[PDB]
Symmetry: D2
Subunit: 376 residues, 4 copies
């Protein structure tokens, strides 16, 4: 069976912003919550860890921590003045580092650790210490720009990890598949003119950043054709994502021949997430993980890293994350998803499924993707 | 300007079930929440009340409470043994009254008060004490069957209120528009063979009850044509609802000529709700309220009652409920919805809007409302 | 029966600091709480309001709000630069205004409203609009110094209200009885050399400010003898407070002849409070209120204002506040205190009670207080 | 340095009662909390575990779990019908198992695991697998009687562990020092006529059970002199506990010559606990642990087990528990207690300290320990 490293540090669960109601800063007409604060709360990630423990999964993984990201690692993406400004605000008790990017006291150090876990997870897999890895990187990364925090992200975790991996191991082709329900704009921007990183984002059309679809943004010059956005219709579920995987993602990976696959794995496409309108269940995440693991085994010697991004349902994210880790490790626990059958009944009807399928067929043709089968 | 009665009692906010993570009972693989609890929490409804107070709107409403529903009122819909079972479980510290219907200690008395508020709101509007009314009825009602609690509902609040109103005032034609995002199966069942109550449900296709669409279920015998289900595609927002209102709801109300309109107003079609996948903002609820108020003014002498049902976003339901009450009262507060512009950017694209519009055109033709 | 004004505004319940675990700022070794934030949370005060509503008490009171305190009112106590600094920090999302004085976004406006309620409550009682009043003033006031926020207090609410009342009504003798369990250092400092305000603090010896007892601090020069501190031994309950009232407070009021009595009413001497070690129950607060109401009826034409200060037990403060309001209004609700009998059993034993009684006898003699009986 | 086993299972943190405001059942005049819940919450114990992890201390301990307590182990203390009643109530979604003993869904299995951890911790220390041990046993045990749950305790964890240890290893003299701030009435009752177990309770005079002091209850017949209660005055802190340890506890342990010391370690004597009125800081718990470890080294070959009982300050219990584990292990982390200096300033004054000291001198003389 497979050796799966689980990169985790309890301190990542200690990052916390000032009072928010969901994503709204408290103040003006927004009353402070009586309990549940900012949507990016420790509790989703903590409940995943707890379920991994009680299920017996954690005992079957290689549990690892890592040193925090060095200034050197961070400076490959971010300027010194960004680091200074972030640290100053963190030392002064927190506040607003960007639009939709609130920080708390000591968040700077915790963000460095989150980035460090992602760096170390790529390193372990490239070094052959594990077949694959899951990094519980909080705070998340995939919206962060080099000089602009956004969407709850303060460092560009995956980009920092990739640039570190290139410096240490000399990997030439990395694919980043971002199935967080929101657009991976940070990864897209950083690698937009680069052909050494294929960035693919599956996202709800127009969700975040708001109004962005992006199908026509395929990269430029050297990077032309090495960025793919799949703007799925709000309301879609299992079939929409499976069709996207089969018609766009897998053909794109086949042409690119990645030596390493990184997944920006948010769980906010789940059917009860407040921050998007998609209808995935735990078995959808399982199936996506199975597909990308297979692609990694065919092109990249099994080298796959999954980095935790979003997911805002305290109740349901634990089941979705568990499914991914079971699939990475090849270990099936006794956990049974209590919402699975219910979510199956809520799925788009045949007319809606056909409508989305036709759009994905059109998009695959627009990308110039050939419907080949998996081989090698 | 209009006189809007606001039926509220603080005790309705004291109803609470045992530990749940969202809708999942704690136990087995479901870890107890560190804070949260059950999705049907007091906090959504409390935060609406708080925002009404801080906005100053409460000062422009006619604030009212009401006695709890009498056994007589409850027994028009529910059997004595249902009342007994419910009370016994409530006295024993709570537990499971139905499928997805958990109760807490004393929930029985609080459910009677919730029903009482709905009864009193209809009565006030029919008596001419107010032009219209909003009832903050928690726990909710629109899924409850005569002998079966479901979907967090323990009495059929709107049905109890209607049967009480018919007994006291003799109203002949009532329309119930249910814009809670889930199917109003309780109201549908009770009035399914009746032509004195037109029941219309806008809901996300297949959301709750799970897998139910219902477009072909138009009522039977005497009630044939007096039930309309509009199963909207998941992911739809403002335009989907505006098209449903213009092509189906308003024409249906025009044909029926209601003497009273009741709205089963859940806010769970809002764009950040965990329990559905729709994309409404506060101005969508404002516009729906404006449309139904206009229909009430045309047919029912302005007689409109809005009864609070679902809505599970603590942050956003208050803004949506506020918009409804502003529209009922004709008073605009200083409150500005902080998510409005953001939600407008997230709406379905033109292709998706066209797809849904065509389905609504087809459905309107099915219903004979071209 | 009596006419009791209840000064309340829902917006006072919207003040909220950044993440704290009890009184500890989150950061370093202090993990963010999963639910319950700073000890000075809205929930204690909100649960009091809720219980007043469901009990039917609120319907028997004169429910009033008030305009926020003007700059003019605030400037009688606080400097312009303090107001500027406070507002700037409030507009920038909150943070630390002093030691143990954290603020949130918009806290400046809410603090002005809290001060406004206290101003208006004194005004109503002096104007004859009500016999007495209760002001649910959050955030609290009694630790705040003219140029230093402290102990969760940002304006000196009672002092601001008194200076406003002197300017508007020309009241000559005001007594402030502070039964919040912590020392009323703000009120003490402001009035320390003044004989127009008698400040009395009952407090747990050394609790907050930490290590302060203060029995020998009786005021200076013109104010000598017009400040009295009663440092009660930690662990004391009903008898300790009754003895303090009878041997010190009532004799001190009798000599002073107040024209108005203000109570700085914290409920944090209750038997389950985390922020002190005293053993009061709801009937202790009832009895203290009865004693001070009687003193107000004898000297001040019934003019009594109770201003809410501390109290950190979400479960129990509502019962204690309810008892005070019942006693002010002369209306007894159906509410029965579920902890009353239990707390009675926990009281100090006879030896401990005798030990504290003897100290209070000694302190009364040290203050030069004659054991006279109530008259007039 | 010392080998310290840390017995923990994540599932112990999943036990949860129905809605309570602190210790008050929700219902009647007690409003449901918006967040909080019952005082015996997972969060205190979870935050201790989290701080042990972030401090790096967990990496220097021998991390262990254990099987749940078998029926055989439980039945040495509790009757079969007690087990049956408890399980039935647990399977039915929870409720009230005793006076101040509420349970939740599945609490039965979780209580068995809590007891199992205590059993295994004693076993490991007696087997020489570790020099000493800390068991994070939730739910707690020290109030539980053989046939009566009380004070949030459902099995008599320490007693079950001791009777199991006597059956397996044949230990003849065990001392149980209970520094939870409340009276260890369960342990006291079970061992009241026994001289093979010395039970000592330090507690706030009259706290819980309410009104109980107990200085004169020294055991009976064969057990006369093998139970000692030290009812400390409410408001006491560091000096009161240090004087109790030096004048009563250590002399009592010297006379008894324990072959094993078990500590019922609640942290609810801490200075910010809602459920008592005492003024300890983390260094008080450190010092108590140092003193009892030294006694264990002198008489019991170092064999010391600390079993977690109470402690209701989410913010402060983690620092107190950390100090105990540092002292057991001989490892000092980088953690600095942020309340330590503040709590030192709040301590009883000299007159009050002298008053309590004199009472302890008198009590030591009563016990014949001058
Ligand atoms: O902007 C937002 C939503 C932010 C959503 C970020 C998603 C983050 C993420 O899950 O992908 C991940 F990065 F965490 F992974 N709300 C508003 C807008 C305007 C005003 C208030 C609130
Ligand atoms: O119970 C649900 C969904 C219940 C949704 C009820 C909606 C109620 C309502 O808003 O319309 C109103 F009535 F409140 F208004 N899911 C589960 C639970 C357990 C297991 C699987 C799925
Ligand atoms: O200083 C404190 C406790 C503050 C207590 C203020 C009491 C406020 C009050 O109730 O009287 C009233 F004003 F609210 F009414 N804790 C520490 C110390 C150091 C480090 C962290 C925490
Ligand atoms: O129940 C209580 C106090 C219970 C205290 C139990 C302490 C348990 C413990 O810490 O020692 C340990 F066992 F957990 F360790 N009060 C009420 C409740 C209802 C009505 C009145 C008073
Ligand atoms: K994405
Ligand atoms: K690229
Ligand atoms: K509906
Ligand atoms: K009908
Ligand atoms: K005081
Ligand atoms: K003075
Ligand atoms: K004890
Ligand atoms: K004994
Ligand atoms: Zn996301
Ligand atoms: Zn609903
Ligand atoms: Zn205080
Ligand atoms: Zn205890």
């Amino acid at each position: 069976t497979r050796r799966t490293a689980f990169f985790f540090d309890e301190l990542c669960l200690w990052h916390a912003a000032g009072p928010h109601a969901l994503t709204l800063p408290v103040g003006g007409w927004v009353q402070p919550p009586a309990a549940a604060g900012h949507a990016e709360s420790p509790e989703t990630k903590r409940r995943l860890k707890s379920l991994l423990d009680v299920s017996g999964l954690t005992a079957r993984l290689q549990l690892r921590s890592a040193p925090p990201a060095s200034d050197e690692d961070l400076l490959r993406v971010h300027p010194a003045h960004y680091l200074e400004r972030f640290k100053a605000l963190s030392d002064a008790g927190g506040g607003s580092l960007g639009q939709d990017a609130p920080i708390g006291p000591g968040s700077y150090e915790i963000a460095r650790l989150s980035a460090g876990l992602a760096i170390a997870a790529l390193d372990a897999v490239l070094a052959g210490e594990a077949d694959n890895a899951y990094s519980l990187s909080r705070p998340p990364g995939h919206h962060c720009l080099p000089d602009q925090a956004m969407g709850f992200c303060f460092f560009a975790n995956i980009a920092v990890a990739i640039e570190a991996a290139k410096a240490r191991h000399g990997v030439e082709r990395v694919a980043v598949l971002d199935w967080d329900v929101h657009h991976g704009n940070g990864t897209q921007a950083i690698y937009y003119r680069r052909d050494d990183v294929l960035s693919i984002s599956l996202h709800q059309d127009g969700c975040f950043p708001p109004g962005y679809s992006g199908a026509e943004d395929i990269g430029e010059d050297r990077g032309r054709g090495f960025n793919l956005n799949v703007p799925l219709l709000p309301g879609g579920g299992h079939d929409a994502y499976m069709q996207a995987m089969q018609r766009i993602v897998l053909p794109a990976l086949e042409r690119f021949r990645p030596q390493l696959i990184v997944v920006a794995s948010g769980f906010d496409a789940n059917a009860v997430d407040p921050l998007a309108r998609m209808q995935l269940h735990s078995d959808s995440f399982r199936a996506m993980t199975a597909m990308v693991r297979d692609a990694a085994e065919r092109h990249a010697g099994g080298r796959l890293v999954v980095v935790h991004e979003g997911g805002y349902s305290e109740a349901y994210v634990p089941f979705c994350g568990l499914a991914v880790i079971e699939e990475l490790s090849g270990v099936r626990s006794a956990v049974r998803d209590p919402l699975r059958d219910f979510i199956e009944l809520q799925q788009p009807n045949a007319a809606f499924r056909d409508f989305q399928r036709q759009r994905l067929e059109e998009l695959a043709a627009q990308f110039g993707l050939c419907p080949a089968q998996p081989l090698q």
